[PDB]
Amino acid sequence: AQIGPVTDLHITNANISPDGFSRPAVLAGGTFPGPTIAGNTGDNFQITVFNDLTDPSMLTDTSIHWHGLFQKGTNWADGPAFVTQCPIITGQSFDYNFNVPGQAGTFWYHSHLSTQYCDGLRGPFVVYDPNDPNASLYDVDDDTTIITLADWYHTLAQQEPIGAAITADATLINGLGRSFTNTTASPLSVITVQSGKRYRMRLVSISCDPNYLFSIDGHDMTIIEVDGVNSQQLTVDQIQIFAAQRYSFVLNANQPVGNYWIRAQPNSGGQGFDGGINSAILRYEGATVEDPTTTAPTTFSNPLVETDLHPLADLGVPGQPFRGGADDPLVLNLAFANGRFSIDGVSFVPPTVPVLLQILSGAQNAQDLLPAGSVISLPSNSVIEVALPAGAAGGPHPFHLHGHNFAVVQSANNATPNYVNPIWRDTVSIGGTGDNVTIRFTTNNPGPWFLHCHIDWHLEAGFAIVFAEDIPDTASANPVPQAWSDLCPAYDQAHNI
Ligand SMILES: *[C@@H]1O[C@H](CO)[C@@H](O[C@@H]2O[C@H](CO)[C@@H](O)[C@H](O)[C@H]2NC(C)=O)[C@H](O)[C@H]1NC(C)=O
Ligand SMILES: *[C@@H]1O[C@H](CO)[C@@H](O[C@@H]2O[C@H](CO)[C@@H](O)[C@H](O)[C@H]2NC(C)=O)[C@H](O)[C@H]1NC(C)=O
Ligand SMILES: [Cu+2]
Ligand SMILES: [Cu+2]
Ligand SMILES: [Cu+2]
Ligand SMILES: [Cu+2]
């Protein structure tokens, strides 16, 4: 069952074996992935998170972010550790009490402390629309139509050795899949459909790192939502999905009753499908209980290309139709060297005092805010443009902005900008060497909003900045509850800070 919009959520340690290999984990709701948190557009969510963690090898503190939810007036509930809060300590709980006006779509939640989400604290978050403009395109949309794609590691996140390459050991689809090495025939996930019906499949990348080439043998996929934003229908036969992105697609159960492979090929780790790695099963009701015998094509006919997506609504693009045609046009220098990432020459290292608390205590320019050089002010009620030219090692980097979605004025692998009708989304691949992926948004949400690469290993290695949006109005806009004010004193006492 789905939980929410008002629910407790306990964070625990447990052993799991999603690929047949047992290791300890950090879990929400006792499962990997965590349970789906759900409600309707405009609802009040009150997620009371109970930190019951005891194993220090995966950190006993925690903090949870609600990815893609704008948190307008509730910046204190956003979750990134040392940006909007101090972590919750073990044996304590905290009510993330917020509303979701004006949003409906497919989201997710995850730890936002260190690399802890990799250790298991990740799950879907769905905001349904009772009046969805896409409702007539499908028959079924429920917990059985959510498809999560996850990387899974045998080595614990905190225990990944400094200086060795990090790759995953299994792809997990709906929490199950097989290991790339020492492969055993552990159970695969089954997604069940009925011949003749149409399904809103909600595809969620909960990845810590790889992008996936997602397909379903014999089928095609009609995209209707991108990172929470309704799209015009776009039919594809493969989706390259980067860390933290979401798509809804209509699956028409229009093939013969049978079994079909579901494929999710990561860009690192095991290549191919030998032994059933990188695989799940689409099973029609009435099919034999057996593995598919289908194959992929050598070449996909209609892969997703980001510039083909367009909003369902008339969203346009703010600003003027040329580079730099914004009130605050920025170009970030994104670099990597010697194990650390940097933005405009500064590698992100989380501060002792969360950025929001520094602002509430009266620090009112961004040059005043710690970490020095990592916090950039944005003016209120202004069009912002951010060019994110690629080239830094470890790409392609999926950049994500908290508090906002954005127009993707320029996409990967295509030098032509689109000032007319590009898709809006919240996580975008910045592409390859020489690219100039560029985003635009308007500043109508006071507070400090993290901008970072969503490859968690890269965030940990410093690939982030904070946009302190409308510093002057942050305090008035974001009244804080006592429990939030209590977090940093409790954390600092527990840690002798
Ligand atoms: C990406 O686009 C930005 C603009 O959105 C380019 O920024 C210009 O950079 C040159 C130096 O390279 C400056 O003289 C300009 O002031 C910048 N802004 C403009 C023209 O609006 C940037 O060069 C582009 N980067 C790449 C790699 O293509
Ligand atoms: C590269 O990106 C551009 C801009 O998004 C794409 O150009 C659009 O193409 C559509 C479809 O033919 C036209 O309706 C638009 O008028 C174009 N807009 C602009 C600003 O040129 C282009 O299709 C993309 N290239 C590829 C190969 O997909
Ligand atoms: Cu996220
Ligand atoms: Cu986010
Ligand atoms: Cu990255
Ligand atoms: Cu983040």
Mutate to test the pocket of ligand 1, among 317, 320, 323, 386 (most ligand atoms within 8 A of CB): 323
CATH number for 1-133: choose from 2.60.40.420, 3.40.50.300, 3.40.50.11540, 3.40.1440.60: 2.60.40.420
Ligand 2 midpoint to CA 421 (Å) = 10
Q: Whose CA is nearest to atom 5 of ligand 1?
A: 323
| Long-range contacts of 294-301, Cβ-Cβ distance < 8 Å, separation of 24 or more | 294/217, 294/218, 294/259, 294/260, 294/261, 295/217, 295/261, 296/215, 296/217, 296/261, 296/263, 297/237, 300/215, 300/237, 300/238, 301/237
Q: Whose CA is nearest to atom 22 of ligand 2?
A: 307
CA distance 471 to 461: 27
Query: Is the distance from CB of 224 to CB of 309 less than 8 angstroms?
Result: no
CA distance 69 to 55: 30
Would you call 495 a catalytic residue per the annotation?
Answer: no
What is the DSSP track for 159-176? Answer: GSPTTS----SEEEETTB
- Classified as helix, coil or strand, 50 is strand
Residue whose entry in the numeric block shows the structure tokens 């527990």: 494
CA distance 292 to 48: 42
314-497 and 1-133 share a CATH fold: yes
Would you call 10 a catalytic residue per the annotation?
Answer: no
Contact 322 CB / ligand 2 (< 6 Å)? no
Helix (H) or strand (E) run with residue 340 in it? strand 340-343
DSSP state of 36: P
To the question of whether residue 458 is assigned a binding role by annotation, the answer is: yes
Q: Which residues contact 272 (CB under 8 A, 6 or more apart)?
A: 265, 278
CB atoms within 10 A of CB 357: 22
Helix (H) or strand (E) run with residue 110 in it? strand 105-111
Would you call 67 a catalytic residue per the annotation?
Answer: yes
CA distance 250 to 141: 10
Contact 444 CB / ligand 2 (< 6 Å)? no
DSSP state of 35: P
- Determined by which method? X-ray
CATH number for 134-313: choose from 1.10.1060.10, 3.40.50.1370, 3.40.50.1240, 2.60.40.420: 2.60.40.420
Query: Is the distance from CB of 107 to CB of 127 less than 8 angstroms?
Result: yes
CA distance 69 to 79: 11
**Residue 420 CA, closest ligand 2 atom number:** 20
The phi, psi pair for 106, rounded to 5°, reads -110, 120
HSE-CB at 391 with a 13 A cutoff on CA atoms is 13
Ligand 3 midpoint to CA 122 (Å) = 9
To the question of whether residue 404 is assigned a binding role by annotation, the answer is: no
- Output the CATH code of domain 314-497: 2.60.40.420
Comparing C-alpha atoms, which of 121, 111, 159, 88 is closest to residue 495?
88
Q: Which residues contact 239 (CB under 8 A, 6 or more apart)?
A: 203, 213, 214, 215, 221, 223, 247, 249, 303, 304
HSE-CB at 226 with a 13 A cutoff on CA atoms is 31
Helix (H) or strand (E) run with residue 484 in it? helix 482-494
Ligand 3 midpoint to CA 452 (Å) = 10
* Sheet with strand 246-252: strands edge to edge: 170-173, 146-152, 198-205, 246-252, 221-226, 229-236
Query: Is the distance from CB of 115 to CB of 133 less than 8 angstroms?
Result: no
- How do the domains of the chain map onto residue ranges? 1-133, 134-313, 314-497
Instruction: Tell me the CA distances in angstroms from 27 to 11, 36, 69, 224, one per residue in order.
Output: 5, 13, 21, 31
Residue whose entry in the numeric block shows the structure tokens 């004010």: 485
Contact 312 CB / ligand 1 (< 6 Å)? no
Query: Burial code of 34-68, b = ≥16 C-beta within 10 A, e = fewer?
Result: bbbbbbebebebbbebbbbbebeebbbbbbbbbbb
Which position among 45, 64, 146, 400 bears the catalytic label? 400
Ligand 4 midpoint to CA 271 (Å) = 29
Mode of pairing for the β-strands spanning 464-469 and 375-378: parallel
Query: Is the distance from CB of 396 to CB of 458 less than 8 angstroms?
Result: no
CA torsion 66-72-77-81 (nearest 10°) is 80
Comparing C-alpha atoms, which of 45, 72, 46, 60 is closest to residue 12?
60
